[PDB]
Design a binder for this molecule. Sequence first.
Ligand SMILES: OC[C@H]1O[C@@H](O)[C@H](O)[C@@H](O[C@@H]2O[C@H]3CO[C@@H]([C@@H]2O)[C@@H]3O[C@@H]2O[C@H](CO)[C@H](O)[C@H](O[C@@H]3O[C@H]4CO[C@@H]([C@@H]3O)[C@@H]4O[C@@H]3O[C@H](CO)[C@H](O)[C@H](O[C@@H]4O[C@H]5CO[C@@H]([C@@H]4O)[C@@H]5O[C@@H]4O[C@H](CO)[C@H](O)[C@H](O[C@@H]5O[C@H]6CO[C@@H]([C@@H]5O)[C@@H]6O)[C@H]4O)[C@H]3O)[C@H]2O)[C@H]1O
Ligand code: NA
Length: 295
Amino acid sequence: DWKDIPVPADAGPNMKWEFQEISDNFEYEAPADNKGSEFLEKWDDFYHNAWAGPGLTEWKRDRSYVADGELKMWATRKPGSDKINMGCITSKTRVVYPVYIEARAKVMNSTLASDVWLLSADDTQEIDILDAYGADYSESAGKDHSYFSKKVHISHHVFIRDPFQDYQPKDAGSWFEDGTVWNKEFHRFGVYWRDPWHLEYYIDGVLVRTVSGKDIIDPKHFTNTTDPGNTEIDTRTGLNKEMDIIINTEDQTWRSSPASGLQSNTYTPTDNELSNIENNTFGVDWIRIYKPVEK
Ligand SMILES: OC[C@H]1O[C@@H](O)[C@H](O)[C@@H](O[C@@H]2O[C@H]3CO[C@@H]([C@@H]2O)[C@@H]3O[C@@H]2O[C@H](CO)[C@H](O)[C@H](O[C@@H]3O[C@H]4CO[C@@H]([C@@H]3O)[C@@H]4O[C@@H]3O[C@H](CO)[C@H](O)[C@H](O[C@@H]4O[C@H]5CO[C@@H]([C@@H]4O)[C@@H]5O[C@@H]4O[C@H](CO)[C@H](O)[C@H](O[C@@H]5O[C@H]6CO[C@@H]([C@@H]5O)[C@@H]6O)[C@H]4O)[C@H]3O)[C@H]2O)[C@H]1O
Ligand code: NA
Protein backbone atom coordinates (compact mmCIF):
# COMPACT_ATOMS: atom_id res chain seq x y z
CA ASP A 1 0.00 0.00 0.00
CA TRP A 2 1.29 3.40 -1.15
CA LYS A 3 0.79 5.20 2.21
CA ASP A 4 2.78 2.49 4.03
CA ILE A 5 5.92 2.40 1.80
CA PRO A 6 8.73 3.57 4.08
CA VAL A 7 9.81 7.19 3.68
CA PRO A 8 13.56 7.08 2.82
CA ALA A 9 14.37 10.49 4.30
CA ASP A 10 15.18 10.77 8.06
CA ALA A 11 12.40 12.57 10.11
CA GLY A 12 14.83 13.37 12.97
CA PRO A 13 15.24 12.31 16.60
CA ASN A 14 11.90 11.24 18.23
CA MET A 15 10.12 12.20 14.98
CA LYS A 16 7.86 10.36 12.55
CA TRP A 17 6.54 11.06 9.02
CA GLU A 18 2.88 12.22 8.96
CA PHE A 19 0.88 11.57 5.75
CA GLN A 20 -0.71 14.73 4.31
CA GLU A 21 -4.25 14.47 2.97
CA ILE A 22 -3.30 16.59 -0.04
CA SER A 23 -1.49 13.48 -1.41
CA ASP A 24 -3.35 11.86 -4.29
CA ASN A 25 -3.34 8.26 -5.65
CA PHE A 26 -5.57 9.16 -8.65
CA GLU A 27 -8.03 6.26 -8.17
CA TYR A 28 -11.11 8.23 -9.44
CA GLU A 29 -12.13 8.95 -13.04
CA ALA A 30 -11.67 12.55 -14.25
CA PRO A 31 -12.63 13.10 -17.95
CA ALA A 32 -10.19 15.45 -19.82
CA ASP A 33 -12.81 18.10 -20.66
CA ASN A 34 -14.92 17.73 -17.48
CA LYS A 35 -12.68 16.93 -14.56
CA GLY A 36 -15.28 16.67 -11.75
CA SER A 37 -15.14 17.44 -8.00
CA GLU A 38 -12.68 14.79 -6.85
CA PHE A 39 -9.94 16.11 -9.11
CA LEU A 40 -10.84 19.76 -8.51
CA GLU A 41 -10.67 19.48 -4.72
CA LYS A 42 -6.92 19.05 -4.97
CA TRP A 43 -5.88 20.29 -8.41
CA ASP A 44 -6.39 22.99 -11.05
CA ASP A 45 -5.88 21.66 -14.61
CA PHE A 46 -3.63 24.53 -15.72
CA TYR A 47 -0.35 26.28 -14.92
CA HIS A 48 -0.56 28.71 -11.98
CA ASN A 49 -1.11 31.79 -14.18
CA ALA A 50 -2.18 32.32 -17.81
CA TRP A 51 1.23 31.66 -19.36
CA ALA A 52 0.89 28.76 -21.86
CA GLY A 53 4.42 27.43 -21.46
CA PRO A 54 7.89 27.55 -22.96
CA GLY A 55 9.28 26.62 -26.43
CA LEU A 56 6.60 25.09 -28.65
CA THR A 57 4.46 24.28 -25.52
CA GLU A 58 0.81 25.44 -25.48
CA TRP A 59 -0.76 24.04 -22.33
CA LYS A 60 -4.49 23.04 -22.42
CA ARG A 61 -6.95 22.10 -19.66
CA ASP A 62 -8.21 19.22 -21.81
CA ARG A 63 -4.80 17.54 -22.30
CA SER A 64 -4.81 16.15 -18.74
CA TYR A 65 -7.15 13.51 -17.29
CA VAL A 66 -7.36 10.75 -14.69
CA ALA A 67 -8.20 7.20 -15.69
CA ASP A 68 -7.45 3.55 -14.87
CA GLY A 69 -5.53 4.47 -11.63
CA GLU A 70 -3.21 7.19 -13.00
CA LEU A 71 -3.01 10.89 -13.70
CA LYS A 72 -2.31 11.05 -17.44
CA MET A 73 -1.34 13.95 -19.75
CA TRP A 74 -0.66 13.69 -23.52
CA ALA A 75 0.58 15.81 -26.45
CA THR A 76 -1.03 16.70 -29.89
CA ARG A 77 0.03 19.17 -32.64
CA LYS A 78 -1.95 22.41 -32.49
CA PRO A 79 -3.92 22.55 -35.74
CA GLY A 80 -2.22 24.93 -38.28
CA SER A 81 0.79 25.58 -36.06
CA ASP A 82 4.15 24.22 -34.93
CA LYS A 83 2.94 24.43 -31.28
CA ILE A 84 2.14 21.27 -29.32
CA ASN A 85 -0.85 21.21 -26.95
CA MET A 86 -0.11 19.19 -23.75
CA GLY A 87 -1.14 19.05 -20.09
CA CYS A 88 -0.23 20.95 -16.88
CA ILE A 89 -1.90 20.73 -13.44
CA THR A 90 -1.20 22.70 -10.21
CA SER A 91 -1.99 21.83 -6.55
CA LYS A 92 -4.69 23.94 -4.88
CA THR A 93 -2.67 23.90 -1.60
CA ARG A 94 0.99 24.88 -1.18
CA VAL A 95 3.74 23.04 0.64
CA VAL A 96 6.76 24.26 2.58
CA TYR A 97 9.91 22.80 4.23
CA PRO A 98 10.31 20.50 6.12
CA VAL A 99 8.44 18.27 3.66
CA TYR A 100 9.10 14.99 1.77
CA ILE A 101 7.33 14.65 -1.60
CA GLU A 102 7.48 11.60 -3.85
CA ALA A 103 5.80 10.73 -7.14
CA ARG A 104 5.58 7.27 -8.60
CA ALA A 105 5.70 8.03 -12.36
CA LYS A 106 6.63 6.69 -15.78
CA VAL A 107 8.80 9.05 -17.90
CA MET A 108 7.51 9.30 -21.53
CA ASN A 109 9.21 7.65 -24.52
CA SER A 110 9.32 11.18 -26.04
CA THR A 111 11.74 14.11 -26.57
CA LEU A 112 9.32 16.20 -24.55
CA ALA A 113 10.06 16.74 -20.82
CA SER A 114 8.18 14.72 -18.14
CA ASP A 115 8.05 17.02 -15.07
CA VAL A 116 7.05 17.01 -11.40
CA TRP A 117 8.19 20.23 -9.72
CA LEU A 118 7.57 22.89 -6.99
CA LEU A 119 7.34 26.66 -7.79
CA SER A 120 6.76 29.62 -5.42
CA ALA A 121 3.72 31.85 -6.07
CA ASP A 122 6.00 34.73 -7.20
CA ASP A 123 8.02 32.50 -9.65
CA THR A 124 11.30 33.20 -7.86
CA GLN A 125 12.07 29.82 -6.28
CA GLU A 126 11.73 26.30 -7.84
CA ILE A 127 12.63 22.68 -6.90
CA ASP A 128 12.59 19.86 -9.50
CA ILE A 129 11.47 16.45 -8.27
CA LEU A 130 11.47 14.78 -11.71
CA ASP A 131 12.69 16.40 -14.95
CA ALA A 132 13.47 13.82 -17.68
CA TYR A 133 13.56 13.52 -21.49
CA GLY A 134 12.80 9.81 -21.91
CA ALA A 135 12.86 8.96 -25.67
CA ASP A 136 14.93 5.99 -26.91
CA TYR A 137 15.32 7.77 -30.28
CA SER A 138 14.80 11.30 -31.79
CA GLU A 139 13.54 11.58 -35.43
CA SER A 140 13.92 15.42 -35.30
CA ALA A 141 17.72 15.01 -34.63
CA GLY A 142 18.06 11.70 -36.56
CA LYS A 143 19.81 10.12 -33.51
CA ASP A 144 19.82 7.55 -30.73
CA HIS A 145 18.56 9.54 -27.69
CA SER A 146 20.04 7.28 -24.97
CA TYR A 147 22.21 10.20 -23.74
CA PHE A 148 18.94 11.52 -22.31
CA SER A 149 16.82 8.31 -21.94
CA LYS A 150 19.25 7.14 -19.18
CA LYS A 151 19.36 10.53 -17.23
CA VAL A 152 17.06 12.30 -14.81
CA HIS A 153 17.75 15.97 -14.09
CA ILE A 154 17.54 16.70 -10.36
CA SER A 155 17.90 20.38 -9.67
CA HIS A 156 16.50 23.64 -8.24
CA HIS A 157 16.40 27.26 -9.54
CA VAL A 158 16.33 30.73 -8.07
CA PHE A 159 15.27 33.61 -10.38
CA ILE A 160 15.34 37.36 -10.61
CA ARG A 161 12.20 38.23 -12.63
CA ASP A 162 12.90 41.67 -14.17
CA PRO A 163 15.30 41.58 -15.84
CA PHE A 164 15.02 37.83 -16.07
CA GLN A 165 17.96 35.79 -14.75
CA ASP A 166 18.08 32.09 -13.82
CA TYR A 167 20.50 30.19 -11.55
CA GLN A 168 20.62 26.37 -11.10
CA PRO A 169 23.54 24.10 -10.08
CA LYS A 170 25.26 22.73 -13.23
CA ASP A 171 27.78 20.13 -11.82
CA ALA A 172 27.64 16.64 -13.38
CA GLY A 173 25.81 15.05 -10.39
CA SER A 174 22.71 17.19 -11.28
CA TRP A 175 21.97 14.54 -13.99
CA PHE A 176 21.59 11.14 -12.37
CA GLU A 177 22.35 8.00 -14.40
CA ASP A 178 22.88 4.37 -13.31
CA GLY A 179 22.07 2.39 -16.46
CA THR A 180 18.25 2.46 -16.01
CA VAL A 181 16.21 3.51 -19.08
CA TRP A 182 13.58 5.58 -17.26
CA ASN A 183 10.80 5.19 -19.89
CA LYS A 184 10.48 1.38 -19.30
CA GLU A 185 8.87 1.35 -15.79
CA PHE A 186 7.29 3.34 -13.01
CA HIS A 187 9.85 4.64 -10.55
CA ARG A 188 9.63 6.65 -7.34
CA PHE A 189 11.19 10.13 -7.48
CA GLY A 190 11.24 12.09 -4.22
CA VAL A 191 12.79 15.13 -2.57
CA TYR A 192 13.25 16.00 1.11
CA TRP A 193 13.14 19.80 1.18
CA ARG A 194 14.45 20.06 4.78
CA ASP A 195 15.09 23.82 5.19
CA PRO A 196 16.00 26.81 2.87
CA TRP A 197 19.60 25.48 2.49
CA HIS A 198 19.22 21.68 2.29
CA LEU A 199 17.63 19.35 -0.38
CA GLU A 200 18.00 15.55 -0.62
CA TYR A 201 16.90 13.67 -3.78
CA TYR A 202 15.73 10.03 -3.66
CA ILE A 203 15.06 7.53 -6.46
CA ASP A 204 13.44 4.22 -5.62
CA GLY A 205 13.96 4.61 -1.91
CA VAL A 206 17.68 5.58 -2.05
CA LEU A 207 19.43 8.89 -1.44
CA VAL A 208 21.04 9.76 -4.77
CA ARG A 209 22.14 13.43 -4.25
CA THR A 210 22.41 15.99 -1.44
CA VAL A 211 22.46 19.73 -2.28
CA SER A 212 23.31 21.62 0.85
CA GLY A 213 24.71 25.07 1.77
CA LYS A 214 24.70 28.67 0.47
CA ASP A 215 27.51 28.23 -2.12
CA ILE A 216 25.46 25.64 -4.18
CA ILE A 217 21.83 26.75 -3.35
CA ASP A 218 22.30 30.53 -4.05
CA PRO A 219 25.99 31.61 -4.71
CA LYS A 220 24.86 34.67 -6.80
CA HIS A 221 22.63 36.02 -3.93
CA PHE A 222 19.49 36.03 -6.20
CA THR A 223 17.58 35.46 -2.97
CA ASN A 224 18.80 38.64 -1.19
CA THR A 225 15.74 40.47 0.27
CA THR A 226 17.54 43.81 -0.51
CA ASP A 227 19.34 44.09 -3.91
CA PRO A 228 19.12 40.58 -5.51
CA GLY A 229 22.36 39.62 -7.32
CA ASN A 230 24.63 41.82 -5.19
CA THR A 231 27.23 39.45 -3.66
CA GLU A 232 28.70 42.21 -1.39
CA ILE A 233 25.63 42.13 0.85
CA ASP A 234 24.00 39.04 2.36
CA THR A 235 20.28 39.02 3.13
CA ARG A 236 19.77 35.71 1.23
CA THR A 237 16.55 33.86 2.09
CA GLY A 238 17.43 30.49 0.47
CA LEU A 239 14.53 28.26 -0.68
CA ASN A 240 12.13 29.59 1.99
CA LYS A 241 8.91 30.39 0.11
CA GLU A 242 5.88 28.02 0.18
CA MET A 243 5.38 26.35 -3.26
CA ASP A 244 2.72 25.00 -5.64
CA ILE A 245 3.18 21.39 -6.85
CA ILE A 246 3.12 21.32 -10.68
CA ILE A 247 2.90 18.16 -12.91
CA ASN A 248 3.28 18.68 -16.68
CA THR A 249 5.06 17.95 -19.91
CA GLU A 250 6.97 20.68 -21.85
CA ASP A 251 8.76 21.37 -25.06
CA GLN A 252 11.70 23.62 -24.04
CA THR A 253 13.43 26.24 -26.31
CA TRP A 254 16.97 24.90 -25.73
CA ARG A 255 15.70 21.54 -27.25
CA SER A 256 13.37 22.72 -30.12
CA SER A 257 15.42 25.82 -31.11
CA PRO A 258 18.95 24.97 -29.98
CA ALA A 259 21.68 27.62 -29.65
CA SER A 260 23.75 25.88 -32.29
CA GLY A 261 21.01 26.23 -34.92
CA LEU A 262 21.92 22.61 -35.87
CA GLN A 263 19.25 20.06 -36.81
CA SER A 264 21.44 17.47 -35.10
CA ASN A 265 20.95 19.07 -31.61
CA THR A 266 17.19 19.68 -32.25
CA TYR A 267 15.07 17.37 -30.04
CA THR A 268 11.33 17.81 -30.42
CA PRO A 269 8.53 15.42 -31.62
CA THR A 270 7.88 15.15 -35.36
CA ASP A 271 4.28 14.60 -36.63
CA ASN A 272 5.20 10.95 -37.24
CA GLU A 273 6.32 10.57 -33.58
CA LEU A 274 3.20 12.32 -32.24
CA SER A 275 1.05 9.72 -34.07
CA ASN A 276 2.04 7.28 -31.24
CA ILE A 277 -0.20 8.44 -28.34
CA GLU A 278 1.23 6.02 -25.73
CA ASN A 279 4.80 7.30 -26.34
CA ASN A 280 3.58 10.84 -25.65
CA THR A 281 1.50 10.09 -22.56
CA PHE A 282 3.05 10.86 -19.12
CA GLY A 283 1.49 8.72 -16.32
CA VAL A 284 1.64 9.40 -12.59
CA ASP A 285 0.38 6.55 -10.36
CA TRP A 286 0.54 8.72 -7.18
CA ILE A 287 2.12 11.62 -5.38
CA ARG A 288 2.56 11.37 -1.63
CA ILE A 289 3.52 14.16 0.75
CA TYR A 290 4.73 13.79 4.40
CA LYS A 291 5.68 16.23 7.20
CA PRO A 292 7.97 15.30 10.13
CA VAL A 293 6.17 15.47 13.54
CA GLU A 294 7.07 14.62 17.15
CA LYS A 295 6.14 11.13 18.33
O1 LIG B 1 24.44 12.77 -27.28
C1 LIG B 1 23.93 14.02 -26.83
C2 LIG B 1 24.51 14.55 -25.50
O2 LIG B 1 25.87 14.95 -25.60
C3 LIG B 1 26.43 15.39 -24.37
O3 LIG B 1 27.82 15.52 -24.51
C4 LIG B 1 25.77 16.71 -23.94
O4 LIG B 1 26.26 17.17 -22.70
C5 LIG B 1 24.27 16.49 -23.76
O5 LIG B 1 23.56 17.70 -23.57
C6 LIG B 1 23.52 18.08 -22.22
O6 LIG B 1 22.24 18.17 -21.57
C7 LIG B 1 22.47 18.78 -20.33
C8 LIG B 1 23.85 18.26 -19.93
O7 LIG B 1 24.67 19.41 -20.14
C9 LIG B 1 24.00 20.26 -21.08
C10 LIG B 1 24.15 19.47 -22.38
O8 LIG B 1 23.53 20.04 -23.51
C11 LIG B 1 22.65 20.27 -20.47
O9 LIG B 1 22.23 21.16 -19.42
C12 LIG B 1 20.96 21.72 -19.68
O10 LIG B 1 21.41 22.76 -20.53
C13 LIG B 1 20.41 23.75 -20.79
C14 LIG B 1 21.10 25.11 -20.78
O11 LIG B 1 21.08 25.60 -22.11
C15 LIG B 1 19.07 23.78 -19.95
O12 LIG B 1 18.91 25.07 -19.35
C16 LIG B 1 18.90 22.67 -18.90
O13 LIG B 1 18.18 23.04 -17.74
C17 LIG B 1 16.79 23.17 -17.94
O14 LIG B 1 16.58 24.38 -17.17
C18 LIG B 1 15.23 24.49 -16.76
C19 LIG B 1 14.36 24.18 -17.98
O15 LIG B 1 14.00 22.78 -17.81
C20 LIG B 1 14.76 22.24 -16.70
C21 LIG B 1 16.17 21.96 -17.23
O16 LIG B 1 17.06 21.78 -16.16
C22 LIG B 1 14.81 23.41 -15.78
O17 LIG B 1 14.04 23.64 -14.55
C23 LIG B 1 12.64 23.80 -14.61
O18 LIG B 1 11.81 22.83 -15.24
C24 LIG B 1 10.43 23.23 -15.32
C25 LIG B 1 9.57 22.08 -15.88
O19 LIG B 1 9.90 20.95 -15.07
C26 LIG B 1 10.18 24.60 -16.01
O20 LIG B 1 10.63 24.53 -17.33
C27 LIG B 1 11.00 25.69 -15.29
O21 LIG B 1 11.08 26.90 -16.06
C28 LIG B 1 10.71 28.10 -15.34
O22 LIG B 1 9.26 27.99 -15.00
C29 LIG B 1 8.69 29.26 -14.57
C30 LIG B 1 9.58 29.91 -13.48
O23 LIG B 1 10.50 30.72 -14.28
C31 LIG B 1 10.24 30.55 -15.72
C32 LIG B 1 11.06 29.32 -16.24
O24 LIG B 1 10.70 29.02 -17.59
C33 LIG B 1 8.77 30.36 -15.61
O25 LIG B 1 7.95 31.44 -15.26
C34 LIG B 1 7.17 31.98 -16.31
O26 LIG B 1 8.05 32.69 -17.23
C35 LIG B 1 7.29 33.37 -18.27
C36 LIG B 1 8.12 34.11 -19.29
O27 LIG B 1 8.77 33.04 -19.89
C37 LIG B 1 6.36 34.44 -17.65
O28 LIG B 1 7.26 35.31 -16.98
C38 LIG B 1 5.44 33.81 -16.59
O29 LIG B 1 4.84 34.87 -15.87
C39 LIG B 1 3.54 35.21 -16.26
O30 LIG B 1 3.50 35.87 -17.60
C40 LIG B 1 2.24 36.52 -17.88
C41 LIG B 1 0.95 35.70 -17.70
O31 LIG B 1 0.79 35.70 -16.24
C42 LIG B 1 1.62 36.72 -15.63
C43 LIG B 1 2.90 36.05 -15.10
O32 LIG B 1 3.78 37.09 -14.63
C44 LIG B 1 1.92 37.55 -16.83
O33 LIG B 1 0.98 38.50 -17.24
C45 LIG B 1 6.25 32.97 -15.58
O34 LIG B 1 5.39 32.33 -14.61
C46 LIG B 1 12.44 25.17 -15.24
O35 LIG B 1 13.16 26.03 -14.40
C47 LIG B 1 20.30 22.35 -18.48
O36 LIG B 1 20.21 21.48 -17.37
C48 LIG B 1 23.67 15.73 -24.95
O37 LIG B 1 23.44 16.67 -25.97
NA1 NA C 1 -2.84 5.49 -8.74
